Design a protein around this ligand. Structure first.
Ligand SMILES: OC[C@H]1O[C@@](CO)(O[C@H]2O[C@H](CO)[C@@H](O)[C@H](O)[C@H]2O)[C@@H](O)[C@@H]1O
Ligand SMILES: OC[C@H]1O[C@@](CO)(O[C@H]2O[C@H](CO)[C@@H](O)[C@H](O)[C@H]2O)[C@@H](O)[C@@H]1O
Ligand SMILES: OC[C@H]1O[C@@](CO)(O[C@H]2O[C@H](CO)[C@@H](O)[C@H](O)[C@H]2O)[C@@H](O)[C@@H]1O
Ligand SMILES: O=N[O-]
Ligand SMILES: O=N[O-]
Ligand SMILES: O=N[O-]
Ligand SMILES: [Cu+2]
Ligand SMILES: [Cu+2]
Ligand SMILES: [Cu+2]
Ligand SMILES: [Cu+2]
Ligand SMILES: [Cu+2]
Ligand SMILES: [Cu+2]
Lengths: 334, 334, 334
């Protein structure tokens, strides 16, 4: 019926993003992705707290899918028989059937193939939504990711100038709700199913126990720090599927920021901190001007410092004293 | 003194909106509204929880008032003798006297008439504000609604194109604070007055027990689902008088969105989720492309699924397979 | 090395702002500021609750620093020997070294001098950030202020028209976390150090006990009410270093509002309520049209009325009946 070229995509684990063109002269294609659901218990903090996670492709967040405006996205979703729950998928980028949720419901042992057309550009959340109280449960359990729909001519500043990024990272923020016991220790559970009751009581009080980038406290620090060099223009995509976030690059700015995350609107310029609406993704580009460590955080500093929400960037290059200088090092007050 | 034609308006109960023109060739008029305050106990959930509500015109939210830029809005507010508290009204659309609160204070048995000029276009909250700690109390009790001030030429996209809506619905989101007892059951009270102490202790902890559209869990589902047909351009006005919200049309987008809700600013385009600042209203227009059920939610999915915050839309028309198709129905994993 | 004129600035205590030009024909200068850190116990409410505060220059927020685009800001930070903790400073307006935090760490008895170039216009937060869990602690303790970086040609509406303000006030909103005892009374502590453990447990639950403008409940009411006259264009700068706020001028509007607070973006017009992202500052200008009291609030009315977050404005001039009139004073219902 639909007579167009097919392109397969190997998805990569966040914060990386599969190779793709920014501007392109290709026409619309059918872009094929596979997602496999994995239920598993995982360690979310350095003190060893465990969590019944549910993931697309074994990661939190799910991998980022990149396509251009007009492409058709054909997704195979697989719920292996080792999973215990029905799952589905809804794309905020898609039109109809609750974003696809209503066509994609699959029990363990099943798979489904869905095609939707990419009519709107920007970055959009995808997430599981099986029904009723299960919706919030699967999402705060890790079943959310994002999809970026680029314009064929690539990004622009709204004033006719191309904005080309040299690299792109995907940062998925996850609010997690782990209940404590009488003594105030986090509880461990055998199955997602048994975690459900206690997790649900706690979720309704709306205060997360952990807020983490990429699935774990510290995931994007040390050896897994994001990297750049002075002069590189870096795009950061940030999703939050349930609760608002306020990302900030410490030492840096957002040179161009789509805080609503939709590229038919012109980016704002020069931001210190931006706002990601719960249930959405946004994008911010910055050209690094100085080397050293930067921290990428949500500027609820309690969340940042105390609940897990910090990534590091490690940037190489030449210090610029014109931009910033220590005039006089610490010293006794005269 | 003010020599202009008078127009009376029969207000309708949300989510409907009284008949009005979008663009108009009439000159400024004095538009006359009546609001009567009702204190009453009401059922807010399907398990029968009750709540001491205080309302304009017996509904939550108050009815939506529509007028054009330059009109004079003349409002009669009535506090019948069967009410037990003084009430007033403040319009965010109005200039001076705490938005009118300071001229509109009335005890049970009294009424007052206020006129203000509509100098600013957009959608704006109105709410009771009697004074001190009473302000938050009356608002989270239901005494808030909205008023839409259209431009005489109707809405535009910012790029010179008219945006005409075929219908408009008003969705009022209410954060409610109902205290539990020692056993963890919601408490019932005889009077608003007696609910005050317990409600106040709980309010200060800032976590609502229920978040509802149009006064009740389920109010805008089943028989009272919002409706449209494929091809209709629908405007949704959303108010939140105290706490932020993040509305999302599941299966749909915001084609044009005034998230700050003021029509002197150009709408943003193509949104997945938008943000209604506490103490404000916003507006989003969407042309339906596909039939079926859509859910309108705040994309805090805990609030949506677990605390009451979901409306349904039921849309008639022809499925479009080009936009979205089930390629392969659920099936055993090969 | 850097061969330019030096200008000293005497900082003033908020909500006032040191004298400065809006548009200017001066070239880039080195602008020199001194900040001295003060740890002290202070009264934050009318019932006499005390709080271990940490401040720049003995106030909450820190004073507002004003400079123009291209200036070099040279800041002497002093940590006197009567303080018990190391402190530093990070500017969101600055580029590199965690906004300066990584060059400015000083123990009691020390001082440091830092210079950064003002490449981006807008209003930006500055705050202490010593490291780890200490970051949120020092900030919610009062160690945050703001810096405004004006364009040399002054502010504009985005459509080529100058916007000149007749006065400017700086409103710093502080979320504070004071723990209660078993009986439910606020606790007093001898030292910042001893407050730390209890404050930290409470901070992680993310619900502040007090939200105050300018350091105290009632600080900007009564004798210290902000003032204006009908016809004055007033700029209000609002910072929030950790948690979001939704400012609203009751009786008024935001005629021009930079909600993200960066002047390379055009202001929005006609707002009822705007949003200050946690970790940022914004600015709103309003021309007063009517006399009387206005309240400036965050339109979480619980925060406003119940947790400390209200300022008053007292405006002189002639009432305008065309804008708003009491047609009929309170009276018995016929
Ligand atoms: O030591 C018993 C005493 O402790 C409480 C705590 O309030 O409950 C604990 O002990 C129960 C019975 O031994 C456990 O089942 C319960 O789960 C645990 O919290 C009281 O119930 C009891 O009187
Ligand atoms: O069974 C009595 C025991 O229960 C507590 C709960 O901590 O209080 C309950 O009983 C009181 C006196 O019977 C009631 O007035 C009170 O309101 C109820 O919670 C204890 O106070 C008491 O020791
Ligand atoms: O009256 C003693 C009784 O009260 C509790 C409250 O649960 O604790 C109080 O008394 C303790 C010992 O007297 C204090 O150290 C404690 O800090 C205070 O809360 C119980 O522990 C105790 O059984
Ligand atoms: O200790 N369990 O609730
Ligand atoms: O059970 N009443 O608090
Ligand atoms: O009463 N002190 O926790
Ligand atoms: Cu799932
Ligand atoms: Cu969603
Ligand atoms: Cu009232
Ligand atoms: Cu209000
Ligand atoms: Cu400090
Ligand atoms: Cu910061």
């Amino acid at each position: 019926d639909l007579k167009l070229p097919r392109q397969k995509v190997e998805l990569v684990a966040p914060p990386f993003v599969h190779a793709h063109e920014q501007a392109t002269k290709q026409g619309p294609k059918i872009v094929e992705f596979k997602l496999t659901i994995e239920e598993k218990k995982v360690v979310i903090d350095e003190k060893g707290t465990t969590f019944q996670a549910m993931t697309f492709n074994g990661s939190m967040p799910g991998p980022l899918m990149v396509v251009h405006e007009g492409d058709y996205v054909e997704t195979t979703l697989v719920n292996p028989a080792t999973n215990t729950m029905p799952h589905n998928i809804d794309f905020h980028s898609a039109t109809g059937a609750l974003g696809g949720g209503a066509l994609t419901l699959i029990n363990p042992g099943e798979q489904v193939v869905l095609r939707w057309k990419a009519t709107k550009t920007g970055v959009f959340v995808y997430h599981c939504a099986p029904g009723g109280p299960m919706i919030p449960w699967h999402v705060v359990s890790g079943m959310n990711g994002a999809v970026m729909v680029l314009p064929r001519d690539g990004l622009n500043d709204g004033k006719g100038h191309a904005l080309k990024y040299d690299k792109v990272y995907y940062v998925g923020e996850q609010d997690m709700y782990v209940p404590r016991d009488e003594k105030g220790n986090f509880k461990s559970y055998d199955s997602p199913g048994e975690a459900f009751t206690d997790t649900e009581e706690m979720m309704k009080k709306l205060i997360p126990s952990h807020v983490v980038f990429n699935g774990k406290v510290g995931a994007l620090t040390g050896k897994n720090a994001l990297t750049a060099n002075v002069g590189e223009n870096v795009l950061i995509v940030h999703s939050q599927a349930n609760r608002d976030s306020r990302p900030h690059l410490i030492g840096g700015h957002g040179d161009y920021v789509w805080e609503t995350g939709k590229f038919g609107n012109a980016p704002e310029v020069g931001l210190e901190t931006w706002f990601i609406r719960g249930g959405s993704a946004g994008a911010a580009m910055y050209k690094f001007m100085q080397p050293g460590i930067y921290a990428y955080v949500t500027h609820n500093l309690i969340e940042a410092a105390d609940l897990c929400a910090t990534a590091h960037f490690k940037v190489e290059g030449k210090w610029n004293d014109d931009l910033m200088t220590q005039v006089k090092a610490p010293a006794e007050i005269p």
